[PDB]
Amino acid sequence: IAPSRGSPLPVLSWANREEVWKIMLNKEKTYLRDQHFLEQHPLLQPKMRAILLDWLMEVCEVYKLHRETFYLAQDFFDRYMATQENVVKTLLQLIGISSLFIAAKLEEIYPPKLHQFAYVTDGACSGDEILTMELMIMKALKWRLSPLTIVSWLNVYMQVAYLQYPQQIFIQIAELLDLCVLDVDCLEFPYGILAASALYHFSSSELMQKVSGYQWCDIENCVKWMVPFAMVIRETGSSKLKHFRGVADEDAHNIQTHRDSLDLLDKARA
Amino acid sequence: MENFQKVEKIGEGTYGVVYKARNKLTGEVVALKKIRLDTETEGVPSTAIREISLLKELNHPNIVKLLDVIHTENKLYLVFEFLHQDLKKFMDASALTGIPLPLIKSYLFQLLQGLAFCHSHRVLHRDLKPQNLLINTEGAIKLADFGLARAFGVPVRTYTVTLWYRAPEILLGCKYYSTAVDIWSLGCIFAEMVTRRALFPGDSEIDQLFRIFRTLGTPDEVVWPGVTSMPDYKPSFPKWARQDFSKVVPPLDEDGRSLLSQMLHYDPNKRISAKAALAHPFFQDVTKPVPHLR
Ligand SMILES: CNC(=O)[C@@H](NC(=O)[C@@H]1CN(C(=O)c2cnn(Cc3ccccc3)c2)CC12CN(C(=O)[C@H]1CC1(C)C)C2)[C@@H](C)OCCC1CCCCC1
């Protein structure tokens, strides 16, 4: 996997950087992606997944959940669907909200309560169904719930760079990734490649290589695929970092936000 | 669960009862943690989900193994390998005779290897106490009870860890945890294995701090830059002098005292790391380095 990839981690006092890096690299071997998994569900359409993930992001903003929580839910959803067949549109909300429930229980210190996850479904999902589904998902995933998400790769990269304002740069790159993740074709690229390509669109090949270890040849295809998405974001001006009551300013860039991404998605795919 | 025969209750936590159970067919002995789903208003407890996923990622000889996860009826069973006792019971059983120093050395070496692996995975254990360290009858020791563990891809914040093994930066109000808190715990455990008595058995946060101060000396900006600026630091703290480690841990040689002193350094930024501790001359007899490339 990416034999041309170097190790960008600086020297670490608390661990052996070669071992830390190798563990991060091994995540791609356990956590798979299948950009064509929807072919296993003939009655579904890729736009249904964009709609579901966009709604989950908005749910995350309302409860001020972390970006990691949203991306864990995205990965759980995508890996779970690859293990299933013939799912229909009317069950996607339950699968999605249950994936978010699991993700929030993993990631947040004080996650919203189950009845809160049922509440946002506006009477379409009960708490008992969410409980049933979380177990279906976790068992189908063989309890492998620790992937290195797309957004965690952005934190790794931005931390290598650290070791205008980094927080604002972070949310602007995250917003491009949020748009790309709505298109199921993003799954053709390793999560690390997707994050490096978004960072490249807001920086340079030199910085991208320094913080991610990828050579230009490694991300060229992703970069070309990502071009329409980066262009629609660029034309709008990127969003601004926001403050969140109850969230420390130094953690504000890690809070999931939501904008009108479905329209942007249409303009990009055009 | 048909092939398991419950043998005895060996524990009980917020989320379930723990039983020693024997595979009726193979004769295997396991530790069964039974989670009663009927009573969990939030589904599978967040600590259980986190611990299951972590243990499936962390495979290492010095980390307790999670053998299986079984969902039967309305119960979730976590099947763990069984180790006959924890380090607290072994130390108490050895209090009159003492633990042979080569066994203390082997256990500490193994504990640091398991910890170094967790830190390599960017995971803080945060609850290393003798009750969470399990031994077998073959000389092995393993880290267990990962319920409080947290990944540190981003800072792990402190929220209003057993007192006796709590690092002084935590007691003084640090806003974040670090890998150094785990090293501090092991340092306390290292001393406890040598003396057969907990090193800092405080009965309150301030008693715990003063106990540390009475042994390692009251910190100042010279030995710990930033102490005087910490939230719970008080200029009224009494001024105690550091004690000679020959009195604190008499059975230990110079190499052991050196390692212990580096594991209990006040400054978290300077406290020895798990990987550096493994390279300490105290362990030269039990290990030798590998040729380095570059
Ligand atoms: C908001 N601040 C942040 O996130 C910080 N992050 C870390 O320090 C993270 C968290 N971490 C810890 O918690 C932690 C726990 N024990 N020790 C060791 C220790 C021991 C004794 C005393 C102190 C510490 C560390 C270390 C940390 C750096 N890690 C890596 O894997 C390194 C390899 C890499 C470059 C990717 C994880 C900074 C560096 O990031 C930059 C901020 C910025 C990114 C860009 C956008 C805005 C925010």
JSON list of N, CA, C and O in Angstrom, two decimals, chain B residues 129-151:
[
{"chain": "B", "resi": 129, "resn": "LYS", "atom": "N", "xyz": [-3.30, 0.39, 38.35]},
{"chain": "B", "resi": 129, "resn": "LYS", "atom": "CA", "xyz": [-3.22, 0.17, 39.79]},
{"chain": "B", "resi": 129, "resn": "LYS", "atom": "C", "xyz": [-3.01, -1.33, 39.93]},
{"chain": "B", "resi": 129, "resn": "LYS", "atom": "O", "xyz": [-3.30, -2.08, 38.99]},
{"chain": "B", "resi": 130, "resn": "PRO", "atom": "N", "xyz": [-2.47, -1.79, 41.05]},
{"chain": "B", "resi": 130, "resn": "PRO", "atom": "CA", "xyz": [-2.21, -3.24, 41.16]},
{"chain": "B", "resi": 130, "resn": "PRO", "atom": "C", "xyz": [-3.43, -4.10, 40.87]},
{"chain": "B", "resi": 130, "resn": "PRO", "atom": "O", "xyz": [-3.26, -5.20, 40.31]},
{"chain": "B", "resi": 131, "resn": "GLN", "atom": "N", "xyz": [-4.64, -3.66, 41.22]},
{"chain": "B", "resi": 131, "resn": "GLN", "atom": "CA", "xyz": [-5.82, -4.48, 40.93]},
{"chain": "B", "resi": 131, "resn": "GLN", "atom": "C", "xyz": [-6.09, -4.65, 39.44]},
{"chain": "B", "resi": 131, "resn": "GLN", "atom": "O", "xyz": [-6.79, -5.60, 39.06]},
{"chain": "B", "resi": 132, "resn": "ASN", "atom": "N", "xyz": [-5.54, -3.79, 38.58]},
{"chain": "B", "resi": 132, "resn": "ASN", "atom": "CA", "xyz": [-5.77, -3.90, 37.14]},
{"chain": "B", "resi": 132, "resn": "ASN", "atom": "C", "xyz": [-4.61, -4.56, 36.41]},
{"chain": "B", "resi": 132, "resn": "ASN", "atom": "O", "xyz": [-4.55, -4.52, 35.18]},
{"chain": "B", "resi": 133, "resn": "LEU", "atom": "N", "xyz": [-3.68, -5.18, 37.13]},
{"chain": "B", "resi": 133, "resn": "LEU", "atom": "CA", "xyz": [-2.53, -5.85, 36.54]},
{"chain": "B", "resi": 133, "resn": "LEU", "atom": "C", "xyz": [-2.67, -7.33, 36.92]},
{"chain": "B", "resi": 133, "resn": "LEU", "atom": "O", "xyz": [-2.73, -7.66, 38.10]},
{"chain": "B", "resi": 134, "resn": "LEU", "atom": "N", "xyz": [-2.75, -8.21, 35.91]},
{"chain": "B", "resi": 134, "resn": "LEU", "atom": "CA", "xyz": [-3.01, -9.63, 36.13]},
{"chain": "B", "resi": 134, "resn": "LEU", "atom": "C", "xyz": [-1.81, -10.53, 35.87]},
{"chain": "B", "resi": 134, "resn": "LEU", "atom": "O", "xyz": [-1.10, -10.37, 34.89]},
{"chain": "B", "resi": 135, "resn": "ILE", "atom": "N", "xyz": [-1.61, -11.51, 36.74]},
{"chain": "B", "resi": 135, "resn": "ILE", "atom": "CA", "xyz": [-0.49, -12.41, 36.56]},
{"chain": "B", "resi": 135, "resn": "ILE", "atom": "C", "xyz": [-0.99, -13.83, 36.39]},
{"chain": "B", "resi": 135, "resn": "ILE", "atom": "O", "xyz": [-2.07, -14.20, 36.85]},
{"chain": "B", "resi": 136, "resn": "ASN", "atom": "N", "xyz": [-0.17, -14.63, 35.71]},
{"chain": "B", "resi": 136, "resn": "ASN", "atom": "CA", "xyz": [-0.42, -16.05, 35.53]},
{"chain": "B", "resi": 136, "resn": "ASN", "atom": "C", "xyz": [0.62, -16.80, 36.37]},
{"chain": "B", "resi": 136, "resn": "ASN", "atom": "O", "xyz": [1.38, -16.19, 37.13]},
{"chain": "B", "resi": 137, "resn": "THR", "atom": "N", "xyz": [0.63, -18.13, 36.26]},
{"chain": "B", "resi": 137, "resn": "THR", "atom": "CA", "xyz": [1.59, -18.93, 37.03]},
{"chain": "B", "resi": 137, "resn": "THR", "atom": "C", "xyz": [2.82, -19.27, 36.21]},
{"chain": "B", "resi": 137, "resn": "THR", "atom": "O", "xyz": [3.56, -20.18, 36.59]},
{"chain": "B", "resi": 138, "resn": "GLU", "atom": "N", "xyz": [3.04, -18.57, 35.10]},
{"chain": "B", "resi": 138, "resn": "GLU", "atom": "CA", "xyz": [4.19, -18.80, 34.24]},
{"chain": "B", "resi": 138, "resn": "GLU", "atom": "C", "xyz": [5.14, -17.60, 34.24]},
{"chain": "B", "resi": 138, "resn": "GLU", "atom": "O", "xyz": [6.03, -17.54, 33.39]},
{"chain": "B", "resi": 139, "resn": "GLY", "atom": "N", "xyz": [4.97, -16.64, 35.14]},
{"chain": "B", "resi": 139, "resn": "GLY", "atom": "CA", "xyz": [5.86, -15.50, 35.18]},
{"chain": "B", "resi": 139, "resn": "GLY", "atom": "C", "xyz": [5.46, -14.30, 34.34]},
{"chain": "B", "resi": 139, "resn": "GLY", "atom": "O", "xyz": [6.22, -13.33, 34.27]},
{"chain": "B", "resi": 140, "resn": "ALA", "atom": "N", "xyz": [4.28, -14.33, 33.70]},
{"chain": "B", "resi": 140, "resn": "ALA", "atom": "CA", "xyz": [3.82, -13.22, 32.88]},
{"chain": "B", "resi": 140, "resn": "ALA", "atom": "C", "xyz": [2.93, -12.28, 33.69]},
{"chain": "B", "resi": 140, "resn": "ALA", "atom": "O", "xyz": [2.30, -12.67, 34.69]},
{"chain": "B", "resi": 141, "resn": "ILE", "atom": "N", "xyz": [2.85, -11.03, 33.22]},
{"chain": "B", "resi": 141, "resn": "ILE", "atom": "CA", "xyz": [1.98, -10.04, 33.83]},
{"chain": "B", "resi": 141, "resn": "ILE", "atom": "C", "xyz": [1.35, -9.26, 32.68]},
{"chain": "B", "resi": 141, "resn": "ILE", "atom": "O", "xyz": [1.98, -9.05, 31.63]},
{"chain": "B", "resi": 142, "resn": "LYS", "atom": "N", "xyz": [0.08, -8.86, 32.83]},
{"chain": "B", "resi": 142, "resn": "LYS", "atom": "CA", "xyz": [-0.60, -8.18, 31.74]},
{"chain": "B", "resi": 142, "resn": "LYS", "atom": "C", "xyz": [-1.43, -7.00, 32.24]},
{"chain": "B", "resi": 142, "resn": "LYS", "atom": "O", "xyz": [-2.00, -7.04, 33.33]},
{"chain": "B", "resi": 143, "resn": "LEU", "atom": "N", "xyz": [-1.50, -5.96, 31.41]},
{"chain": "B", "resi": 143, "resn": "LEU", "atom": "CA", "xyz": [-2.33, -4.81, 31.73]},
{"chain": "B", "resi": 143, "resn": "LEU", "atom": "C", "xyz": [-3.79, -5.20, 31.48]},
{"chain": "B", "resi": 143, "resn": "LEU", "atom": "O", "xyz": [-4.11, -5.91, 30.51]},
{"chain": "B", "resi": 144, "resn": "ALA", "atom": "N", "xyz": [-4.70, -4.76, 32.36]},
{"chain": "B", "resi": 144, "resn": "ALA", "atom": "CA", "xyz": [-6.08, -5.13, 32.16]},
{"chain": "B", "resi": 144, "resn": "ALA", "atom": "C", "xyz": [-6.96, -3.94, 32.53]},
{"chain": "B", "resi": 144, "resn": "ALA", "atom": "O", "xyz": [-6.47, -2.87, 32.92]},
{"chain": "B", "resi": 145, "resn": "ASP", "atom": "N", "xyz": [-8.27, -4.12, 32.38]},
{"chain": "B", "resi": 145, "resn": "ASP", "atom": "CA", "xyz": [-9.24, -3.09, 32.75]},
{"chain": "B", "resi": 145, "resn": "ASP", "atom": "C", "xyz": [-9.04, -1.78, 31.99]},
{"chain": "B", "resi": 145, "resn": "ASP", "atom": "O", "xyz": [-8.66, -0.74, 32.55]},
{"chain": "B", "resi": 146, "resn": "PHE", "atom": "N", "xyz": [-9.31, -1.83, 30.69]},
{"chain": "B", "resi": 146, "resn": "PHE", "atom": "CA", "xyz": [-9.16, -0.68, 29.81]},
{"chain": "B", "resi": 146, "resn": "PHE", "atom": "C", "xyz": [-10.41, 0.22, 29.76]},
{"chain": "B", "resi": 146, "resn": "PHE", "atom": "O", "xyz": [-10.56, 1.02, 28.82]},
{"chain": "B", "resi": 147, "resn": "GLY", "atom": "N", "xyz": [-11.30, 0.12, 30.75]},
{"chain": "B", "resi": 147, "resn": "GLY", "atom": "CA", "xyz": [-12.52, 0.93, 30.75]},
{"chain": "B", "resi": 147, "resn": "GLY", "atom": "C", "xyz": [-12.29, 2.43, 30.77]},
{"chain": "B", "resi": 147, "resn": "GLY", "atom": "O", "xyz": [-13.08, 3.19, 30.19]},
{"chain": "B", "resi": 148, "resn": "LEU", "atom": "N", "xyz": [-11.21, 2.88, 31.41]},
{"chain": "B", "resi": 148, "resn": "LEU", "atom": "CA", "xyz": [-10.93, 4.30, 31.48]},
{"chain": "B", "resi": 148, "resn": "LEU", "atom": "C", "xyz": [-9.98, 4.79, 30.38]},
{"chain": "B", "resi": 148, "resn": "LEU", "atom": "O", "xyz": [-9.70, 6.00, 30.32]},
{"chain": "B", "resi": 149, "resn": "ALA", "atom": "N", "xyz": [-9.47, 3.88, 29.54]},
{"chain": "B", "resi": 149, "resn": "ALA", "atom": "CA", "xyz": [-8.53, 4.23, 28.47]},
{"chain": "B", "resi": 149, "resn": "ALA", "atom": "C", "xyz": [-9.11, 5.21, 27.47]},
{"chain": "B", "resi": 149, "resn": "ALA", "atom": "O", "xyz": [-10.30, 5.15, 27.14]},
{"chain": "B", "resi": 150, "resn": "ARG", "atom": "N", "xyz": [-8.26, 6.12, 26.97]},
{"chain": "B", "resi": 150, "resn": "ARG", "atom": "CA", "xyz": [-8.70, 7.12, 25.99]},
{"chain": "B", "resi": 150, "resn": "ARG", "atom": "C", "xyz": [-7.59, 7.36, 24.97]},
{"chain": "B", "resi": 150, "resn": "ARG", "atom": "O", "xyz": [-6.41, 7.44, 25.33]},
{"chain": "B", "resi": 151, "resn": "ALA", "atom": "N", "xyz": [-7.98, 7.45, 23.68]},
{"chain": "B", "resi": 151, "resn": "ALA", "atom": "CA", "xyz": [-7.03, 7.70, 22.60]},
{"chain": "B", "resi": 151, "resn": "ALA", "atom": "C", "xyz": [-6.65, 9.18, 22.67]},
{"chain": "B", "resi": 151, "resn": "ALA", "atom": "O", "xyz": [-7.48, 10.02, 23.03]}
]
